[PDB]
Structure 1
Amino acid sequence: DDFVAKLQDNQRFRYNEVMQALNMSAALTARKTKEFRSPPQEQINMLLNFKDDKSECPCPEEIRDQLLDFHEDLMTHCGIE
């Protein structure tokens, strides 16, 4: 619930950033707005790349840390570690 709320607020603010970026530069805007052009499932898939160090997701480190802590707690409950 709250993870999705924060992610949506993130994308709301990123949309304002890229909409200024469009008025600054139109040619570069493609890569800015690709993750808005993508279907929602693809958007979730690109946004949920916190794992490992590929780290091409545009999400901030604090939001990454929230999911990482939740995943560690879930693994601890599951008994993996």
Structure 2
Amino acid sequence: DDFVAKLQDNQRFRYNEVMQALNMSAALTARKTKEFRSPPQEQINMLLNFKDDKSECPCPEEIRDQLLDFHEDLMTHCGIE
């Protein structure tokens, strides 16, 4: 619940700030908005593709930390470690 709330508000902020700089970027807005114009499942997988390095993920570290800590807690609950 709250993780996707944070992701949604962050994505709104990122879209807003990208639209702020579209004039100065000119044709350069393209790859940046490739993320914004994509199927929702692909958006989810791109936002979640930060498990092992792979810096090609727009999720900031302060939001990555929540998912990493919850994954650690889930693994401990499952008894993996």
Smaller-chain TM-score bracket: over 0.9
Instruction: Quote the offset at 1:12 in angstroms.
Output: 0.6
Any residues of structure 2 matched to 1:55-66 within 5 Å, and which? 55-66=55-66
Gaps of 5+ in 1: none
Residue ranges of structure 2 left out of the alignment (5+ in a row): none
- What does the per-residue CA deviation read over 1:20-58, in whole Å, with 9 as the maximum and x for residues that have no partner? 121212211001100011110000000001200112110
Distance 1:20 1:29 in 2: 11
Correspondence 1:74 to 2:43: no
- Report the number of matched residues: 81
User: Per-residue deviation at 1:78?
Assistant: 0.1
Of 65-74 and 16-25, the range deviating more from structure 2: 16-25
Q: Which ranges of 4 or more aligned residues in structure 1 deviate by more than 6 Å?
A: none
